[PDB]
Design a protein around this motif. Structure first.
Motif, short mmCIF file in Angstrom:
data_model
loop_
_atom_site.label_atom_id
_atom_site.label_comp_id
_atom_site.label_asym_id
_atom_site.label_seq_id
_atom_site.Cartn_x
_atom_site.Cartn_y
_atom_site.Cartn_z
N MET A 36 -17.66 2.19 -4.98
CA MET A 36 -16.45 2.99 -4.88
C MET A 36 -16.28 3.82 -6.14
O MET A 36 -16.98 3.63 -7.14
N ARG A 37 -15.34 4.76 -6.09
CA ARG A 37 -15.21 5.74 -7.15
C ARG A 37 -14.90 5.07 -8.49
O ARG A 37 -14.22 4.04 -8.55
N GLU A 38 -15.40 5.68 -9.56
CA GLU A 38 -15.38 5.04 -10.87
C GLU A 38 -13.95 4.84 -11.37
O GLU A 38 -13.62 3.78 -11.91
N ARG A 39 -13.10 5.85 -11.21
CA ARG A 39 -11.72 5.75 -11.67
C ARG A 39 -10.95 4.64 -10.98
O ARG A 39 -9.92 4.20 -11.50
N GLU A 40 -11.41 4.17 -9.82
CA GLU A 40 -10.79 3.07 -9.10
C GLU A 40 -11.33 1.72 -9.54
O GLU A 40 -10.55 0.80 -9.82
N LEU A 41 -12.65 1.57 -9.59
CA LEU A 41 -13.25 0.31 -10.03
C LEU A 41 -12.85 -0.01 -11.46
O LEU A 41 -12.53 -1.16 -11.78
N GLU A 42 -12.87 0.99 -12.34
CA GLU A 42 -12.49 0.77 -13.73
C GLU A 42 -11.06 0.26 -13.83
O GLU A 42 -10.79 -0.72 -14.54
N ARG A 43 -10.13 0.90 -13.12
CA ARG A 43 -8.74 0.48 -13.19
C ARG A 43 -8.54 -0.90 -12.56
O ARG A 43 -7.73 -1.69 -13.05
N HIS A 53 -8.15 -7.94 -15.91
CA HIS A 53 -8.05 -8.48 -17.26
C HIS A 53 -6.61 -8.84 -17.61
O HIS A 53 -6.35 -9.87 -18.23
N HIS A 54 -5.66 -7.99 -17.21
CA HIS A 54 -4.25 -8.18 -17.54
C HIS A 54 -3.53 -9.08 -16.54
O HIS A 54 -2.29 -9.01 -16.43
N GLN A 55 -4.26 -9.91 -15.80
CA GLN A 55 -3.67 -10.94 -14.95
C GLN A 55 -2.77 -10.34 -13.87
O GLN A 55 -1.88 -11.01 -13.35
N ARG A 56 -3.01 -9.08 -13.51
CA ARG A 56 -2.23 -8.45 -12.45
C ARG A 56 -2.57 -9.00 -11.07
O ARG A 56 -1.87 -8.67 -10.10
N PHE A 57 -3.62 -9.81 -10.95
CA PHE A 57 -3.92 -10.50 -9.71
C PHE A 57 -4.94 -11.59 -10.01
O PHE A 57 -5.78 -11.46 -10.90
N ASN A 58 -4.86 -12.68 -9.23
CA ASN A 58 -5.68 -13.85 -9.47
C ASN A 58 -7.06 -13.72 -8.82
O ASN A 58 -8.08 -13.78 -9.50
N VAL A 59 -7.08 -13.54 -7.50
CA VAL A 59 -8.33 -13.44 -6.75
C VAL A 59 -8.82 -12.01 -6.80
O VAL A 59 -8.04 -11.06 -6.72
N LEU A 60 -10.14 -11.84 -6.94
CA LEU A 60 -10.79 -10.53 -6.91
C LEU A 60 -12.02 -10.66 -6.02
O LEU A 60 -13.07 -11.14 -6.47
N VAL A 61 -11.90 -10.25 -4.76
CA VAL A 61 -13.05 -10.25 -3.86
C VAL A 61 -14.07 -9.25 -4.42
O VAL A 61 -13.81 -8.05 -4.44
N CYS A 62 -15.21 -9.76 -4.86
CA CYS A 62 -16.15 -8.98 -5.65
C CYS A 62 -17.55 -9.08 -5.05
O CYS A 62 -17.88 -10.03 -4.35
N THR A 63 -18.37 -8.07 -5.33
CA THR A 63 -19.78 -8.15 -4.99
C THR A 63 -20.51 -8.83 -6.14
O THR A 63 -19.89 -9.50 -6.98
N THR A 64 -21.83 -8.70 -6.19
CA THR A 64 -22.63 -9.31 -7.25
C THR A 64 -22.56 -8.53 -8.55
O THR A 64 -23.33 -8.82 -9.48
N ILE A 65 -21.67 -7.54 -8.65
CA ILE A 65 -21.49 -6.80 -9.88
C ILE A 65 -21.02 -7.69 -11.03
O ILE A 65 -21.17 -7.32 -12.20
#
Length: 53
Positions: free
Chosen positions: A15-22, A28-40
């Motif tokens: 997905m677009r860089e400005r979205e993944l980065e944010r 990092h700032h604990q704005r959400f607990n779970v992060l459905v992530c790929t192998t990145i």
DNA sequence: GGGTATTCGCCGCGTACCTCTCCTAGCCCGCAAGTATCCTATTCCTTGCAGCGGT
């Protein structure tokens, strides 16, 4: 839906860089607990507060 | 029963030497060798709507 109590975001490199980065910055700032992530996150992202994969 | 005839199946058909070719089919199982989807870099461009000079 399975866990209504959790705040969930999506993170991957196709997905677009400005979205993944944010999204990763918010994680990092604990704005959400779970992060459905790929192998990145297999390369050594630290995030000490995360302790369940 | 029996003497006869008729059939049926087995056994048999030379020696010596020279040249050449070819001696199972098929299955299985494991090697191994060649392919469709997932992330982080790359080169490839083609639209949609608001500013905006300029008159």
């Amino acid at each position: 839906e399975l866990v209504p109590e959790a705040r969930i975001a999506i993170g991957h490199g196709q997905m677009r860089e400005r979205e993944l980065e944010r999204v990763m910055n918010d994680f990092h700032h604990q704005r959400f607990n779970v992060l459905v992530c790929t192998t990145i996150i297999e390369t050594g992202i630290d995030i000490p507060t995360a302790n369940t994969i």
